[PDB]
Amino acid sequence: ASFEDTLKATIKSNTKQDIKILKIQNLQSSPDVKLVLIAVGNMQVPIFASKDGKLVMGVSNVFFAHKSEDMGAVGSLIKQ
Amino acid sequence: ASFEDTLKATIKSNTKQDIKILKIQNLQSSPDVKLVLIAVGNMQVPIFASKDGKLVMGVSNVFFAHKSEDMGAVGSLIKQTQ
Numbered sequence: 001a002s003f004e005d006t007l008k009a010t011i012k013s014n015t016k017q018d019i020k021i022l023k024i025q026n027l028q029s030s031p032d033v034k035l036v037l038i039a040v041g042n043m044q045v046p047i048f049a050s051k052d053g054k055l056v057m058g059v060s061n062v063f064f065a066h067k068s069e070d071m072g073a074v075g076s077l078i079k080q
Numbered sequence: 081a082s083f084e085d086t087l088k089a090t091i092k093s094n095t096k097q098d099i100k101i102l103k104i105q106n107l108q109s110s111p112d113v114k115l116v117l118i119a120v121g122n123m124q125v126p127i128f129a130s131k132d133g134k135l136v137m138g139v140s141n142v143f144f145a146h147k148s149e150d151m152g153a154v155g156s157l158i159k160q161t162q
Contacts, residue, residue, distance in 0.1 A: 006146070010109075014144040014151075029090075032112040032130035033137070048128070048137050050112035055150075057113070057128050058142025064094035066086070066134035071094075 006053030007036065017041070025073060029065040037077055046077045086133030087116065097121075105153060109145040115154055117161065126157050 001009070004021050011019050020039040027035055037046045048057045063074050081089065084101050091099055102124065103117040117126045128137040143154055 010144055010146045013146065027135065030130045030132050030134040032132060033135050047142070050110040052110050052112060054109040054146035055107060055113050056142070056144045057137055058140035060138035060140040062127065062136070062138025064091055064136045066090045066093075070135075 001053075003034070003049075003051070003053045007038075007049055007056065008053075010049075010053055010056060011038070011040075015040075023077070025077065027065065027067075027070045027073070029067045029070050035070075035074055035077065037080065044080070046074075046080070081133075083114075083129075083131070083133045087118075087129055087136065088133075090134055091118070091136055103157070105157065107145060107147075107150045107153065109147040109150050115139075115157060117157060124161050126154070126161050 017040055022039055022044060023037040025035045032051055034049050034051055036049050046059045059078055065071055097120055100119045102119055105115045107113055107115055112131055114129045114131055116129045126139045139158055145151055
């Protein structure tokens with residue numbers, strides 16, 4: 001099952017909610033976690049997701065990346 | 081560089097703090113992310129870490145997993161810290 005289909009399933013299975021995947025952004029630091037922006041209800045909201053889509057973790061204000069630029073990336077979409 | 085060493089590096093380089101790793105817990109839903117509990121000074125704080133230790137992401141009150149048990153696992157570990 002693709003990342004978007006797994007990711008869609010993973011959220012629905014825990015929230016009963018049908019989401020739209022708006023924007024997927026890869027992280028230069030590592031391929032294990034993809035920064036993704038989804039539409040739930042009336043808001044667009046960002047999350048972190050395992051590359052397989054079987055885990056989502058909400059964006060918090062703790063985020064350190066081996067590469068500096070990715071911190072800009074998350075900071076950009078959290079302003080989005 | 082090993083997972084605990086990379087994780088130590090990637091945290092220190094950005095908070096210039098030296099931390100110990102107390103507990104590492106793998107998530108059954110995926111191996112891509114490890115739930116890890118570290119010590120900053122006299123605080124214990126849980127975090128999520130890419131399996132290679134090159135991303136640390138704070139535990140928030142959003143976390144969804146494909147396998148149900150993993151939610152129990154993090155929910156217990158957030159209780160141990162506070």
